[PDB]
Design a protein around this ligand. Structure first.
Ligand SMILES: Cc1cc2nc3c(=O)[nH]c(=O)nc-3n(C[C@H](O)[C@H](O)[C@H](O)COP(=O)(O)OP(=O)(O)OC[C@H]3O[C@@H](n4cnc5c(N)ncnc54)[C@H](O)[C@@H]3O)c2cc1C
Ligand code: SF4
Ligand code: SF4
Lengths: 117, 410, 490, 410
């Protein structure tokens, strides 16, 4: 527990150092995030001061997403295991990635053969 | 599960060593008055849940009884009786006019709210007001309990008795009539005990190497007192690690930077685990941290000449035997951690007298009591070839048994 | 900092010596010991974007474990030394480890990242070791799903796909019944695959576990003339058609009428049934102890036929195949993302080479056959050499060499050159439509023309593997669960 | 072992039938104040043995508590709590201002001596004097307890409170301020109950055939009262057998020849066992003898229209069900044997008032209370399709639960 707390504090300090705010007290008020995909109305209502370009999803969509996740997780009536993540690695059936094995080996084969098709 | 049986066994051993008959053991094995009550309570939502209460008076031959109160959700009758006997042993060791006792409530302060705790305490007093009074019982602060609960209890007992009784309950706020130094009592007690132990063993306090693992209020105040006295601190530890410096650690700076929790370790610096901290060279070691730390594996690695168990039973029987064989002085926790009881007694005396002492007077009286008790137990433990834990238990039981014999219950 | 892939050299478990492999009908290999298994598991390098899990058709050949085994995860767990967790992760996805480990040809071994110029990690052997140790320690016990809703699915066919679908549906909470013609459930796993590969004790144990779950198999029901499709539909909501694919193509060449010519499937089924019945003492099988044996049609079927003939102690065995002998290493037109085509030398061939002293040779390739002999039994077989040549537009063509005619003495002959779709038009009681004897359906959404009829396994896949069958069974189980109850996570 | 669980189950059933929430059950399942004490005692030889005491107050919402005291060597906390709940049910049924309770001591009156019993009782009162008083508790006679022990307890409470409190304890001797008819209270109660049951069922009391097995004081007084009223007795039994005469048995002669023990059987004459006695023809049957007599085998043989269980649970659940199916009125023991409690209450009222009534006044008041209670329970049991035992338990719990709800503990 102590090591996890220390590591998380070190990470928070690193994130602070990324921006340049050297005080947690200052960063606390500071809103240094840029929502990517949140509607302008929602940003003005709840995240005033945050920068958003494309607007995006709404409160109803966020609620629907949360409810879907909660319902699936509390259903979970088939197995006692956590599905494998796909944030930092590719696992079949997981989150799609730009460089999947299909694309990788197709590109390699085409490049090595000099074939255009 | 084994707490009551262990308490009974140690009491039996002490009585056997004293040589009194088995009647005293028969009388003292069990508390003489155990009360179980049910406290109605109203929640914020309006629903009513019933909390189970407890109260035990181990003995009152010496005089008025005393005991703490823990809002621990796993409090049971066996634990309550064991704690009552333990508090009686503390009182006997310190030579107070208290008999001993303990109370408790089955609840969860975590999910409980502020007003709900207020109502809970008030219902508890309304429930047990009959067998509780200035000459019968005296609550005191304990686990999940503090000055606000003490003040509510005092206010209600004033209401029910129709006259002010500040001496009814100890551990009150300063404005309500509390006693100064209520927070540094344990630190002062351990400071006196370490000083006297060093004097008796010949270790000069000036320049003595000290290690204090566990840097709560007790650890912080103990370090400050050691620095003021002159002894150098060569180790501190907390929930986030520890440090090490053979030539001091600037206790003034450490206390200045001390936060609310007492955490002191740096952020981007490696720390030393308590397991390796225990092995560091030092004259006196002061485990005031999680229990069950000194065991067989580290018994051969310990190096301190004096070990003070400020915590509650941090060691085990095997470690105690190994230390005794190695001839390392082991201060019993019963005597190490009696500062709280002593300051509570002083607070009660101040309330009864109606006049409040000062910090210097409290300091002098507390150190006098502690040095006298430690000298008595040390003399008895050297007169009889036994362990200091056995000497402490024997001395504590002596007063209770002898007072019972005078009063003629046996 | 894992470094096993270069600091360790791939090894193999303790196999029984070939010269004694021909006497006892038992498993010819054993799993790794603890230390060896840990060392082999350490080889895998926590491979990011693993190529052992793609499981998709690539250039006409499979690559990667189709059932999506968490290969890096349980390899890491095997290395770490926690085995119950590895078993749990394996059983999360796979349902028949005891068959997949000791049957599957392991395309995952052939195709992964570490296979670039170096021996691959023994995924198959690690899986087999995990499942065998789990079974030995008896951690596997029936799940007995508490929840149950009165329904009825009548899976047909006891093959691996049928068993997987039945297990998934039973875990879902729908009662199922398995209709089978053969005496014992399992399908190919019982009779087709030899005792060598799959000792039937393990199959029987797994079927008993399924019965304890409550699958409630029913035997000796060809669900054709015996039971009509209309009554089956009326008595049961859905039907998972794991009907199998057992029709085998025949060589339309003159001379294939004389007695002696036999089918590989029928011969293997007869031999396995005889052994399971009375240790082949019933004398109701095909004997070849004192006769020559020739098998036409290379592949797993040919290997199994050669092994069975060798165990029957035939005087001579020769395997024939049109495809030219494979090269000894990767070629220009073959790459590691694709399943390799290197010389394999699996079981039943090194054993033949070792045992045969007078003729220590095998793999007579580049010629299949033509018109055989006559006058009762087979006396001799004619053969001619063919070579793969480019024609028209650089297209492969088979042209015979007129001057390479040869004669071989053959009294018993087997044909295992391939297989066809399901047994159609025999099972025309339903309204399903077939294109090339295979019932028509697409990967996912197996709902065919008639409601409640779902394709599955080799019936729609043509010829595939047990892992493919298991994947199809799981997917059709999910599809039918969604069709019935609408909502089902898996 | 199962007494506490059975009491809790029947209380739960009664509360469920009433329809109150589960909070009342949570509060009433357990007594609100259980005290365990140790009583020093000096024997004739001079040695000291420690007796374990007990005391339980099931509830005091209605008013002052009440309970007996048994010197039974196997008394335990479970039995004490069960008896406290049972006494509370009795008080609720009779509609008294009592809440309920019970005390006990772990001793053996057999080997105990006279002066030693005196000292034992006196030490018991000195031990539990704090939570016992005229408005808090009221001891009463019970198993292994009688007028001499009541008088000693009264004398000591007078000593400790410094003023006379005759109403402190009931069941005192007549000269000390007792109440007349203390010995025939149970007989009078059962006489009223049998009369009312016969009236309600239409059985004419004049000429009614009666069987009274168990010829102690209760049986003797009941037979005398029946003879005075007019009903004929056609069977009596005791520890030495019984008799049988369809046309009377000369109850006057039987009572005249009655010895100290109540034995009446001849010497050189055959007697009838209770098993066959139960089967004899009769209108009303009154089992006041050893428990567990009416069971499945004799349920089909019983013939009486009215069965009164003057004893404590002489029947079983199977017998009760069979009798209910046969449509035989079954008087609950809780109502049958409440005469002792009623006369004790009258004695307490007389002491509190300071003026003593007469036999006729006690007779009239007792019969009025008994008839009112029996009529109320009969009406409720006919309004609700239930057994009379369930009706008794329900009525008893109604008052306690409703008073608690008013007082707001829930
Ligand atoms: C290493 C390896 C070796 C292999 N060796 C062989 C081999 O030697 N021979 C071979 O043929 N395949 C072999 N295969 C292929 C494999 O056995 C099959 O592709 C697959 O197992 C069959 O799947 P299935 O679910 O259709 O099982 P199937 O057994 O095909 O399922 C059909 C079941 O239903 C029964 N059935 C038949 N007709 C009907 C009907 N009308 N109604 C109801 N039930 C019916 C069948 O008897 C059978 O029990 C091998 C595969 C691998 C990976
Ligand atoms: S089933 Fe076959 S491909 Fe999949 S992991 Fe096992 S051996 Fe490899
Ligand atoms: S088998 Fe190959 S792709 Fe799979 S985890 Fe190992 S190195 Fe990576």
């Amino acid at each position: 527990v102590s090591k996890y707390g220390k590591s998380i504090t070190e990470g928070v300090v690193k994130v602070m150092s990324k921006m340049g705010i050297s005080t947690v007290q200052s960063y606390r008020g500071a809103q240094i995030f840029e929502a990517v995909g949140i509607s302008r109305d929602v940003i003005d209502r709840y995240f005033s001061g945050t920068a958003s370009q494309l607007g995006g999803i709404d409160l109803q969509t966020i609620a629907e997403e949360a409810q879907r996740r909660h319902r699936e997780a509390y259903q979970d009536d088939y197995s006692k295991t956590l599905e494998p993540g796909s944030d930092f690695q590719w696992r079949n059936g997981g989150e799609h990635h730009a460089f999947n094995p299909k694309t990788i080996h197709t590109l390699q084969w085409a490049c090595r053969r000099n074939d255009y098709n | 599960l084994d707490v009551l049986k262990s308490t009974q066994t140690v009491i039996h051993k002490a009585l056997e060593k004293l040589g009194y008959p088995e009647e005293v053991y028969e009388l003292l094995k069990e508390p003489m008055r155990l009360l179980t009550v049910k406290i109605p309570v109203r929640m914020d939502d309006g629903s009513v849940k019933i909390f189970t209460g407890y109260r035990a008076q181990h003995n009152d031959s010496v005089g008025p009884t005393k005991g703490g109160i823990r809002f621990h959700p796993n409090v049971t009758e066996k634990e309550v009786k064991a704690l009552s006997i333990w508090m009686s042993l503390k009182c006997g060791i310190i030579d107070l006019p208290y008999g001993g006792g303990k109370g408790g409530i089955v609840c969860d302060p975590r999910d409980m709210s502020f007003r709900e705790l207020e109502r809970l305490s008030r219902g508890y007093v309304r429930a047990i007001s009959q067998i509780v009074g200035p000459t019968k019982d005296v609550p005191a602060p304990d686990v999940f309990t503090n000055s606000q609960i003490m003040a509510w209890m005092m206010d209600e007992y004033s209401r029910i008795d129709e006259f002010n009784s500040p001496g009814f309950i100890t551990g009150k706020p300063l404005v309500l009539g509390g006693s100064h130094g209520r927070e540094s009592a344990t630190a002062k007690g351990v400071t006196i005990c370490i000083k006297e132990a060093a004097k008796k063993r010949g270790i000069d306090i000036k320049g003595a190497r000290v290690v204090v693992q566990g840097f709560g209020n007790a650890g912080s105040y103990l370090a400050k007192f050691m620095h003021d006295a002159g002894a150098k601190v060569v180790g501190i530890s907390d929930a986030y690690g520890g440090l090490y410096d053979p030539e001091g650690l600037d206790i003034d700076y450490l206390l200045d930077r001390r936060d609310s929790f007492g955490t002191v370790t740096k952020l981007f610096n490696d720390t030393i685990t308590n397991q390796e901290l225990l092995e560091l060279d030092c004259d006196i070691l002061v485990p005031a941290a999680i229990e069950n730390q000194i065991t067989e594996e580290n018994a051969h690695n310990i190096r301190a000449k004096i070990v003070v168990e400020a915590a509650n039973g941090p060691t085990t029987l095997e470690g105690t035997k190994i230390l005794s064989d190695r001839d390392i002085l082991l201060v019993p926790d019963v005597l190490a951690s009696a500062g709280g009881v002593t300051v509570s007694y002083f607070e009660w005396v101040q309330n009864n007298q109606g006049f409040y002492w000062s910090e210097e007077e409290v300091e002098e009286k507390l150190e006098k009591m502690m040095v006298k008790s430690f000298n008595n137990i040390y003399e008895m433990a050297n007169n009889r070839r036994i362990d200091m834990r056995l000497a402490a238990y024997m001395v504590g039981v002596r007063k209770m048994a002898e007072a019972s014999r005078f009063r003629g219950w046996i | 900092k894992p470094t096993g892939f270069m600091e360790i050299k791939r090894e193999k478990p303790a196999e029984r010596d070939p010269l004694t492999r021909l006497k006892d009908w038992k498993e010819y290999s054993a799993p790794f010991s603890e230390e060896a298994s840990k060392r082999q598991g350490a080889r895998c390098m926590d491979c990011g974007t693993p190529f052992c899990q793609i499981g998709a058709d690539i250039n006409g050949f499979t690559s990667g474990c189709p059932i999506y085994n968490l290969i890096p995860e349980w390899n890491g767990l095997v290395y770490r030394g926690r085995w119950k967790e590895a078993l749990e992760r394996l059983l999360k996805t796979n349902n028949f480890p005891e068959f997949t480990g000791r049957v599957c040809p392991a395309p995952c071994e052939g195709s992964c990242t570490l296979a670039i110029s170096d021996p691959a990690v023994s995924i198959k052997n690690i899986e087999r070791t995990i499942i065998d140790k789990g079974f030995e320690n008896g951690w596997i016990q029936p799940r007995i799903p508490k929840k149950r809703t009165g329904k009825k699915v009548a899976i047909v066919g006891s093959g691996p796909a049928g068993l997987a679908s039945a297990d998934q549906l039973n875990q879902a909470g729908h009662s199922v019944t398995v209709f089978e013609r053969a005496d014992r459930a399992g399908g190919l796993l019982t009779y087709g695959i030899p005792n060598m590969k799959l000792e039937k004790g393990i199959v029987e144990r797994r079927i008993k576990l399924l019965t304890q779950e409550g699958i409630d198999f029913v035997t000796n029901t060809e669900i054709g003339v015996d039971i009509t499709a209309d009554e089956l539909k009326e008595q049961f909501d859905a039907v998972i058609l794991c009907t199998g694919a057992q029709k085998q193509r025949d060589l339309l060449i003159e001379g294939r009428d004389s007695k002696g010519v036999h089918y590989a499937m029928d011969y293997l089924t007869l031999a396995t049934k005889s052994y399971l019945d009375s240790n082949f003492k019933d004398k109701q099988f095909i004997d070849a102890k004192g006769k020559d044996v020739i098998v036409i049609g290379g592949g797993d079927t040919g290997a199994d036929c050669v092994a069975t003939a060798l165990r029957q102690k035939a005087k001579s065995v020769h395997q024939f195949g049109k495809h030219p002998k494979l090269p000894p290493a990767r070629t220009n037109d073959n790459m590691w993302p694709e399943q390799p085509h290197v010389f394999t030398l699996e079981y039943a061939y090194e054993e033949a080479e070792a045992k045969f002293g007078r003729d220590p040779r095998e793999y007579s390739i580049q010629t299949t056959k033509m018109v055989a002999d006559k006058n009762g039994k087979l006396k001799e077989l004619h053969t001619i050499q063919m070579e793969k040549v480019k024609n028209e537009h650089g297209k492969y063509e088979f042209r015979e060499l007129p001057g390479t005619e040869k004669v071989w003495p053959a009294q018993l002959v087997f044909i295992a050159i391939g297989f066809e779709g399901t047994e159609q038009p025999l099972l025309k009681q339903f309204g399903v439509n077939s294109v090339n004897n295979k019932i028509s359906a697409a990967y996912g959404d197996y709902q065919t023309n008639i409601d409640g009829v779902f394709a599955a396994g080799d019936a729609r896949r043509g010829q595939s593997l047990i892992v493919w069958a298991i994947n199809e069974g799981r997917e059709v189980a999910r599809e039918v669960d969604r069709y019935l109850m609408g909502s089902s996570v898996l």
